[PDB]
């Protein structure tokens, strides 16, 4: 009902992109267990600085797949109300499972 996976890259919009959803909790009816941030796993890629005849170090840099998730034991339809509103993600893909 209420396992909901807040994906994303942008990280400062997940401590807020969730803290705001867990407040449809304290508004709809659900003693909600806040954002559970299941581990980030990272797809980093290292690549030769120069275009020819470097080779020793390069510069690495990561693509931190961030991740969180949300919970409760209570799912009324006023919940459904809030969730169709207050949507504030710049680019933070979110899915739902029951």
Partner 1 sequence: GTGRRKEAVARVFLRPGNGKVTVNGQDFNEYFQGLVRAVAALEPLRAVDALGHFDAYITVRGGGKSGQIDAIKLGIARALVQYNPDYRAKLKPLGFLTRDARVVERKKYGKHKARRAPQYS
Partner 2 sequence: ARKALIEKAKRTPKFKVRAYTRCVRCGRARSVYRFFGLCRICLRELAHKGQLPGVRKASW
Partner 3 sequence: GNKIHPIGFRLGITRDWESRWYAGKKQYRHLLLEDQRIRGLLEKELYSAGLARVDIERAADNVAVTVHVAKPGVVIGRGGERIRVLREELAKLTGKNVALNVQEVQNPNLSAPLVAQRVAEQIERRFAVRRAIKQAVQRVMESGAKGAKVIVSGRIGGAEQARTEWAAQGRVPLHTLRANIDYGFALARTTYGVLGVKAYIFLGEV
Partner RNA sequence: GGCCGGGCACUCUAACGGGACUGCCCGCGAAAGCGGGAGGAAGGAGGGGACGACGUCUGGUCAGCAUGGCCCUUACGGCCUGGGCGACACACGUGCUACAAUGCCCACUACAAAGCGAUGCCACCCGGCAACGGGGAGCUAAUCGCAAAAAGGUGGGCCCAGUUCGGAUUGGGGUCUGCAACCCGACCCCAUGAAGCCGGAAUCGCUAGUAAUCGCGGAUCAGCCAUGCCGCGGUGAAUA
Residues in 41-70 at the binding interface with RNA, rule: CB under 7 A: 41-46, 50-53, 56-60, 64, 66-68
User: What count of other Cβ atoms lies within 10 Å of the Cβ of residue 91?
Assistant: 8
Q: Does 15 sit near partner 3 (CB under 8 A)?
A: no
40 within 8 A of 71, measured Cβ to Cβ: no
Q: Binder to partner 3 among 8, 24, 25, 68 (CB under 8 A)?
A: 8
DSSP three-state, residue 86:
coil
Binding residues (CB under 8 A) for partner 2: these are 9-10, 43-45, 47-51, 59-64, 91
């Amino acid at each position: 009902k209420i396992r909901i996976k807040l994906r994303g890259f942008d990280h400062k919009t997940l401590d807020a992109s969730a803290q705001k959803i867990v407040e449809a909790a304290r508004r709809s009816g659900a003693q909600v267990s806040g954002p559970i941030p299941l581990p980030t796993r990272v797809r980093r890629f290292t690549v030769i600085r120069g275009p020819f005849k470097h080779k020793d170090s390069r510069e690495h840099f990561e693509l931190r797949t961030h991740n969180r998730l949300v919970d409760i034991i209570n799912p009324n339809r006023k919940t459904i109300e809030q969730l169709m509103t207050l949507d504030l993600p710049t680019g933070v893909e979110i899915e739902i499972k029951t």
